[PDB]
Design a protein around this ligand. Structure first.
Ligand SMILES: C[C@H](CCC(=O)NCCC[N+](C)(C)C[C@H](O)CS(=O)(=O)O)[C@H]1CC[C@H]2[C@@H]3[C@H](O)C[C@@H]4C[C@H](O)CC[C@]4(C)[C@H]3C[C@H](O)[C@]12C
Ligand SMILES: [Zn+2]
Lengths: 339, 49, 49, 306
DNA sequence: TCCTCTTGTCAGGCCGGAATAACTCCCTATAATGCGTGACACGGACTCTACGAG
DNA sequence: CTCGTAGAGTCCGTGTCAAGGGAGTTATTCCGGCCTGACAAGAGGA
């Protein structure tokens, strides 16, 4: 056991997300329904997360404790303690960069204020109602100017080249990567030396503080948009067998299933060169799935299968009353107690 | 008493042996918390100095 | 049959008779509840009802 | 989004079907027009005859029995070899006649895809080599881009632009010797690439532009049709909404099925599209509801038995 | 007299064919076309009042 | 000398608490038999 202190929090970079994860979860399958062993490489996977039963591989070639670092050649499961299946994380390759809800919809929209663009505008961008000019060259249009459908059409038709604009969360990420923190910070401090209006000054200070902290911490803005999505270890969203044949699963299994399905379908639709409208719908649905996954409660309320109650997303699982369910009230049942 | 697996088993053995020591470890709920927050795009690591 | 048995079984107003005293039975059968579907909630309630 | 596109009435649908037919036929003729594809045809037909391949791996029905195919491919080999010997005007007319006789054949889609892809990758190699050679030239020799266009364009095979650029005696023209080896070796390599093409170095341009035109035409026609029939897809979707799958997922699977149907639809049979497409849209919707519904996925036959 | 060394024959783990399952390629041809409390505090938008600049 | 803008104020709204038919191919369990270790009883030597 380490002797630690100072717990550090920062945005996870995509290479770190790949770093923690041991394998990619490509197919939504969970278990074989005949023999309830986990399917590879599904949401429950022994070769990725861990061996089901202590010190025994899936296919059953290696069963002795003497084998502990060998990795079964047929089934790519390493022979180790089943408890490891509680900590190993997975990851999913998302085809279309999707926005992180927490950094968008929270009353102060930090993407918005970093981009000094109101929330409604960004909403219009992600849902594919209008484009945004990402470096619109030597033209009569600014760098954060929105163009409507047929304004983008008249511009493209007239301006074929020297004009870079896009739609959706990938557009947002692209334009976000390009912003020069240092120069904009210098501009804002020059405003502070020259600008004298109470509320404008106040807002300016706010923006300045955000930029300063962001550039000091070492977080790069483009990470606010997620490319790789980590998947929680299986044991924390278990699929335990109830007695009598019936099964119980946490909702996260369903949410992950939905995300993987829509991601795979988008992959296929892209490979087929499908019409734009349908790919756009696909990106909308994927955004929806992700937003249910990260923080359920900021949208159209995706109910679960046949249960009427909204399914509980990660954010709900963390925040409770009060907050930490088992760490905070209430409250860690204890042994050696009577009443 | 509740969430530390190794601690609870070691303390069972200690009590049976007639010794009274302790070995707290990390509460399992906190480990779950780390994994659950890490499931988001939030990096939470235990630093060292 | 699904809707009828759902109402009778899995409903707020369909509850286990408390059958330990004749008084308990008779009083439970002659009861008037303001809860349930189409009715007030405890948090909703108010203090004037 | 669906509401914007109005209903592509019947005669419009037959119109776009003719445009699709024209694009597909154009691209099929275009394939016919380079002498390295019949190499692979005859080679795998013999594979089929020597029994190293399959009778269904090469053709999907002729146009105007094993006897007929075997004889037509024997005479195909004969004509091919004789026009290859007689390559040295006459070769262009004989290639046109070989292509016109080969038009008779219809290959099953994967092999036609493979042939269009082999011709695509050879043209890709051509364009990539020319682009890298011109990059090295313009950037290391500071080659003005107007003389680049005029002189370099047209041959891509002869040394006329090479020896004219070095002949202009310009000081960057003298540095041109610094990378003369790379540039002229790439010119020779390209000449060999077209020696394996064999026709020339301009018909590569003609073929890629004609193929792009056909493909774009076909894609646009199918886009129009699909956007017109989105309403049909959503209409059929209403049945399956409450099988634990989401509404929009259903509509998407239906869209994929409708795409397939459009790709396989034949108007010439004379029947209305909607009835025919219904089959594929329902097939896709049913298969997806069966597959993505349950948590512990269950094979489709077992679902049918349930 | 006690402990050690020896002759001899069976059994269990492992692999092969078979037979019931699964997954993709055939799926098709009349027409069907949009349908699913409540108090608090803070922030944003709109209005009013007053000042400075052209 | 006159007009528009800047600043201040108020009201409202939000988050947060209190239709299946099938042909071909491969996987997987299941019974039948081969191939190498291990077990029994006695004998001989210290
Ligand atoms: C969905 C259902 C919820 C029932 C519920 O919530 N009842 C609440 C009943 C409340 N009342 C009526 C008893 C009143 C209150 O308790 C007291 S008061 O009125 O509120 O004061 C769950 C909870 C227990 C689950 C069963 C068990 O696993 C055993 C068995 C396992 C098999 O593999 C599958 C079948 C079985 C029968 C399961 C079925 C089903 O999966 C059950 C009933
Ligand atoms: Zn194994």
């Amino acid at each position: 056991t380490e002797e630690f202190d100072a717990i550090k929090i920062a945005l996870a970079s995509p290479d770190m997300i790949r770093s923690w994860s041991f394998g990619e979860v490509k197919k939504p399958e969970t278990i074989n329904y005949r023999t309830f062993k986990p399917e590879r490489d599904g949401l429950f996977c022994a070769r990725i997360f861990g061996p089901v039963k202590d010190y025994e591989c899936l296919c059953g070639k290696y069963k002795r404790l003497k084998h502990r670092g060998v990795i079964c050649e047929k089934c790519g499961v390493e022979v180790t303690q089943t408890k490891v299946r509680r900590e190993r994380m997975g990851h999913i390759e998302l085809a279309s960069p999707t926005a992180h809800i927490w950094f968008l919809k929270s009353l102060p929209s930090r993407i918005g204020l970093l981009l000094d663009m109101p929330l409604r505008d960004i909403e219009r961008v992600l849902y594919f109602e209008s484009y945004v000019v990402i470096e619109g060259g030597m033209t009569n249009l600014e760098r954060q100017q929105i163009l409507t459908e047929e304004q983008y059409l008249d511009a493209l038709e007239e301006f074929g080249d020297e004009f870079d604009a896009k739609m959706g969360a990938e557009a947002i990420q692209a334009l976000l990567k390009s912003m020069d923190l240092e120069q904009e910070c210098e501009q804002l401090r020059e405003e502070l030396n020259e600008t004298n209006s109470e509320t404008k000054r106040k807002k300016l200070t706010k923006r300045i503080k955000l930029l300063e902290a962001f550039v000091q911490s070492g977080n790069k803005p483009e990470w606010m948009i997620l490319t790789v999505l980590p998947v929680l270890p299986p044991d924390l969203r278990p699929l335990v067998p109830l007695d009598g044949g019936r099964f119980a699963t946490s909702d996260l299994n369903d949410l992950y299933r939905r995300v993987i399905n829509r991601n795979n379908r988008l992959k296929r639709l892209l490979d087929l060169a499908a019409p734009d409208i349908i790919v756009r719908n696909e990106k909308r649905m994927l955004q929806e799935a992700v937003d249910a996954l990260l923080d359920n409660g900021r949208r159209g309320r995706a109910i679960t299968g046949s249960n009427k109650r909204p399914l509980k997303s990660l954010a709900d699982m963390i925040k409770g009353k009060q907050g930490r369910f088992r760490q905070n009230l209430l409250g860690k049942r204890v042994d050696y107690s009577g009443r | 008493k509740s969430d530390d697996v190794n601690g609870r088993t070691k303390m069972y053995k200690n009590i049976v042996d007639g010794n009274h020591q302790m070995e707290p470890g990390m509460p399992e709920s906190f480990n779950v918390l780390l994994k659950e927050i890490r499931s988001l795009g939030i990096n939470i690591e235990l630093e060292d100095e | 049959s699904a809707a009828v048995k759902e109402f009778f079984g899995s409903s707020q107003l369909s509850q286990f008779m408390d059958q330990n005293n004749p008084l308990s039975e008779i009083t439970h059968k002659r009861r008037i509840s303001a809860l349930g579907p189409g009715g007030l909630t405890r948090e909703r309630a108010g203090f004037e009802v | 989004e669906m509401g914007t596109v109005e209903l592509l009435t019947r005669e419009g649908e037959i119109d776009i079907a003719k445009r699709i037919e024209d694009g597909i036929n154009q691209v099929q003729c275009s394939v016919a027009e380079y002498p390295e594809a019949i190499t692979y045809l005859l080679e795998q037909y013999d594979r089929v005859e020597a029994e190293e391949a399959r009778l269904s791996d090469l053709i999907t029905g002729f146009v105007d029995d094993p006897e007929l195919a075997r004889e037509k491919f024997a005479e195909l080999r004969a004509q091919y070899v004789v026009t290859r010997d007689t390559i040295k005007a006459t070769a262009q007319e004989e290639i046109l006649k070989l292509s016109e006789v080969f038009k008779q054949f219809r290959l099953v889609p994967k092999q036609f895809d493979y042939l269009v892809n082999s011709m695509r990758v050879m043209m890709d190699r051509v364009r990539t080599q020319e682009r890298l050679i011109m990059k090295l030239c313009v950037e290391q020799c500071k080659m003005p881009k107007k003389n680049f266009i005029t002189l370099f364009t047209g041959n891509e095979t002869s040394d006329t632009w090479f020896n004219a650029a070095i002949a202009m005696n310009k000081p960057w023209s003298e540095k041109l010797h610094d990378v003369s080896e790379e540039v002229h070796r790439a010119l020779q390599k390209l000449q060999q690439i077209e020696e394996e093409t064999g026709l020339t170095i301009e018909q590569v341009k003609d073929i890629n532009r004609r193929m792009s035109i056909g493909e774009a035409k076909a894609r646009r026609a199918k886009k129009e049709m699909v956007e017109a029939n989105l309403r049909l897809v959503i209409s059929i979707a209403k049945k399956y909404t409450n099988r634990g799958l989401q509404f929009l997922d259903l509509i998407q699977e239906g869209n994929i099925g409708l795409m397939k149907a459009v790709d396989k639809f034949e108007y010439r049979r004379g029947y209305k599209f909607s009835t025919y497409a219904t089959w594929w849209i329902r097939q896709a919707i049913t298969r997806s509801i069966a597959d993505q519904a349950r948590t512990i996925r269950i094979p489709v036959h077992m679902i049918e038995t349930i």
